[PDB]
Design a protein around this ligand. Structure first.
Ligand SMILES: CC(=O)NCCc1ccc(S(N)(=O)=O)cc1
Lengths: 168, 170
């Protein structure tokens, strides 16, 4: 709960276990990492008064998922945009100083009503923390947007921290 | 609606547009493809009388996602297991002979209550078709489970996939 913005290099440090420390929350490394930068994170304000994350992924035509998904119909997988939102809620719990390794526990309603094409410039994630239950877990609502346009929503994103993940 | 099982080589042909034809449903190619084989597909019977899919992914410690998810703590991303279930509902709509390209529309409740480690042998997907809507838009609603080595680890209610003769809405 010191830094309120993180750079790509900060996020790669996190993926190595070197931001929050060994045994604590880690972002995935490439090619599962679906965030370039966290432009803002806070534990106050947001839609519910329990904090907010705003993060960005830069798009170019050469990103790996465009060639295989699908052949002659390139589109960013919806599952990876949803994953970015789980990734961010895990980051939030680690950023708050809780111990242990992140697992996605699932979500309420998810809706896809738009897409990320290879001609897009930038994906923005808006995450509104709804509740932290202190085993340690966060509930959040999120949206995925591409160059200003909302395309995906998730209600009741759930992520937990595990001080032993072997009971799972 | 002749063939009730598909090999990995059949799924790759699908990913090239060569199973259902150009402009119709497509599986992803590697490395977004999360299915090795469709063991069973049918459009009658099943939990709701609209058929079922059973499909498998072989697990080994070298699958790409274990190295980066996470360093020192390898676990199959839950989002890829969910994605396999959306890809299977898309496949079903194609296999029924509907035209157009597939897009996932989303899900009701998803629960992850176990995990796939790099020491596992096989992931199995069970998809129960609940409803197909054949109006202005071709749509399927389904329930799904992901299991690893016999144990149920994920559930999804109200998986929704559509076929688009033009995906220009999105
Ligand atoms: C096999 C088939 O028709 N697939 C199309 C359905 C389909 C499934 C998943 C996604 S995603 N990864 O963008 O969430 C898109 C389309």
């Amino acid at each position: 709960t010191k830094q309120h913005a993180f750079t790509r290099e900060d996020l790669l440090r996190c993926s190595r276990g070197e931001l929050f420390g060994p045994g604590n929350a880690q972002l995935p490394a490439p090619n599962m990492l679906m965030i370039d930068r966290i432009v803002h994170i806070s534990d106050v304000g947001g839609k519910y008064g329990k904090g907010e994350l705003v993060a960005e992924l830069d798009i170019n035509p050469d990103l790996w998922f465009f060639a295989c998904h699908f052949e002659g119909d390139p589109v960013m997988p919806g599952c990876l945009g949803l994953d970015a939102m789980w990734q961010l809620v895990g980051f939030y719990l680690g950023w708050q100083g809780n111990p242990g390794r992140g697992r996605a526990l699932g979500s309420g309603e998810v809706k896809f009503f738009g897409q990320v094409l290879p001609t897009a410039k930038k994906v923005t994630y808006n995450i509104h923390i709804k509740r932290t239950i202190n085993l340690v877990l966060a509930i959040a609502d999120g949206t995925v947007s591409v160059d200003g346009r909302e395309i995906y929503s998730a209600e009741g994103l759930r992520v937990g921290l595990f001080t032993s993940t072997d009971s799972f």
